[PDB]
Symmetry: D2
Subunit: 246 residues, 4 copies
């Protein structure tokens, strides 16, 4: 009965690998009907393969309003309205400011910040009608700490928290909570990229002495998604091994 999501419909954007996959799997373990998304049809099918009778994968581009609308209609049709939205889809377009292109700025705003606006708005009417809901944004320690060469990504991840706090204020009295989980450096395809010196240097900033695991983010998201977290709203739950302490 602890942390039970039976009866809830969850949408996890960008569930094909790493953190989003871990989130989608754990939410299904806890009893939710889960819809995970990828940017391609084959990616969507790979999600359906791992969810089995616990849900389905769908193709979604969170920068395209028509895609968002089609996906939410399909979910409502087959499963009913979204009770738990996890805004996990996100990208990087790293560069020092001196080298940062207009398109690198805009791609990050569109994918990592504006998406959260669009998806949150799109699921909110259903949640307000039922007087119950969860929105959980996947932020980053970089949103709080800043990082050289990621001024775009940091702006977007910080903006997500300001959005979250304001939305939380609007919807709290109607039983909807809005929160962010901010991972530190987690072992995924974003990371295996870093070279050895960079990895060693990232690790040296972590008291725990290791990168996080995707499952560790999934656990934090599942906790905030639960009935037991009803009195948490407008909050950022930092899961970073002590890399930053707020």
């Amino acid at each position: 009965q602890f942390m039970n999501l039976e009866g809830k419909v969850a949408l996890v954007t960008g569930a094909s690998r790493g953190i989003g996959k871990a989130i989608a799997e754990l939410l299904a373990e806890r009893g939710a009907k889960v819809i995970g998304t990828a940017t391609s049809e084959s990616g969507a099918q790979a999600i359906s393969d791992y969810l089995g009778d616990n849900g389905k994968g769908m193709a979604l581009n969170v920068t395209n309003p028509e895609s968002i609308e089609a996906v939410l209609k399909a979910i409502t049709d087959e499963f009913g309205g979204v009770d738990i939205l996890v805004n996990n889809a996100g990208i990087t377009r790293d560069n020092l400011l001196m080298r940062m292109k207009e398109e690198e700025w805009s791609d990050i705003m569109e994918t990592n910040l504006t998406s959260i606006f669009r998806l949150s708005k799109a699921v909110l009417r259903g949640m307000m009608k039922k007087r119950q809901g969860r929105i959980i944004n996947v932020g980053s320690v970089v949103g709080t700490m800043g990082n050289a060469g990621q001024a775009n990504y940091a702006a977007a991840k910080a903006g997500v928290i300001g959005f979250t706090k304001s939305m939380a204020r609007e919807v709290a009295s109607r039983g909807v909570t809005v929160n962010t989980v901010a991972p530190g450096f987690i072992e995924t395809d974003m990371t295996k990229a870093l070279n050895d010196e960079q990895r060693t240097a990232t690790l040296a900033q972590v008291p725990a002495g290791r990168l996080g695991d995707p499952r560790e983010i999934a656990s934090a998201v599942a906790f905030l998604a639960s009935p037991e977290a009803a009195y948490i709203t407008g909050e950022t739950l930092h899961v970073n091994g002590g890399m930053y302490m707020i």
Copy 2:
């Protein structure tokens, strides 16, 4: 199952006779922990024994008395093998505007709400290091982060809990121990039930959720941080306040 499972862990929860501490103790027992809850009185310690049953026991502890701390921890070590999860929940208020605040109101709070965290945390740390696994969870307050008129002593102690938590977290992270604070908003307990009708109405007006929190809601946050699943969370303050304050 093995999800949020605390089987095999020994938990000490200070001030488990009522309120938030009682809810913490009951939930940690539900999750499989062997729980020792404490009260300042023998009647409270027996009431804790009674509600825990085969899942644990109650002991009398005054967290301002080092001899009491030493005795309780020895009892726990002798029988159960010593503390894997420490929940520093015991705390009090001694409210007054600063111009009316007595030296004893200041010291009572430092001793009960802040120095207690230093003493208890130090006393359990050796055993946790040896096992390469531990959890310390301090119960802070939204007031530590926000401040509150009439509670400068309480606010200083609760803010100081976080400073301690961050420092200890940096010291012990590489040996498998996490140290974190859960900071409740206004929770329905005897401490809240203190406020008059006007003050309660005015407090509720500050909470977006439009209600006080339930002790169980703090227990859930504590149980989550106590779990194996929270091993990458350390030096963190988890705010459970209905939106009263947002960090």
Copy 3:
């Protein structure tokens, strides 16, 4: 004297026709800076020229238009040698509850309040690096830290300003440039004068100081961060809010 002295520095203050930006511009000129203040209109740009007199000049700038940015910065470089102190003050609101919020209300805010900071900051940075000295000061808002119903777009932009500020600060600190945000509470300007009587009363009730702030009070904080005396402050948010929020 040489205390908080800005003689020899070129300051660009966006949105200096009224409100907080006007007060910033007037104070930076008082402290010795050569000030270029901007308005969206030629009448406003001339009014700025008129109040600055021999201490500076006004120019028309729309911070959402990259051609306008390029033209203004070239004018400043050609005449005055380019910007030593950038104050990103220009900003707007497009308030609505989320369920009523239009795509254009979201985009107008991202563009005016957030992307403008990226564009202007990038455009002045090369010159500041070359000189091994610079100041960028962004005007944020208490709303970026606290959130506010009806302002999710504004709050996201203002919070995003801080994320940008921290990252840029880390990039440019070792080359003599500091990057910081001043986050005002509710300040008496046309933006505040927006609120109805009930809303204004309710806003004042949230401010311990019991008044709105004055534009001059934000100008003072900006002037302090712009000074040589603030060289060890970077990546910081200086809150000027009468106690409305406390971090």
Copy 4:
């Protein structure tokens, strides 16, 4: 007229060297009548030597209520009531928790936290009568970040901020502001202590690439002390070269 303190009486605790000396000197430059303190009579005289006709040094132990009372009476007698209180006096008693003595804990609570309570209370009646005042606490980045081997110091410096916020709420409507300046690592006698590896390691955590100067803390304190900072209360002004970004 900018940052003018003419007519104000300032008490700076622990003004014999480093940060406190810099604070006392700058406040006097800006026109305040300054009383700086040391723990000895010779220390007090050294303060009187540098202040000259701008003020005086006094012997004060901020852990002793009778000393506090005597010092405030002497100030009221000679200068009038304290308008600006700068709580700068502070010590370290470093140790890993495993080695931390009860006396090392208590000395830090008494000197660094309880002192702020006692002095603040003692100056507040005068400030509330006049409907104008400034209290500025000298915190530490360690209060916000934490630091291994300084759990006592971090507790005390963090507690100072919770105290400050609560006091600010009580006194704001009567024209008194209460704030903290949180230095990063500043070149003083606290620091020259660190060995070369430790210095190098501290510096590597600072984007600015240098330790701060005492004058840099003095400037921040003088700004908060000014009439121009009337709308700042309950705030922490971080002066740390980017070592931590809040």
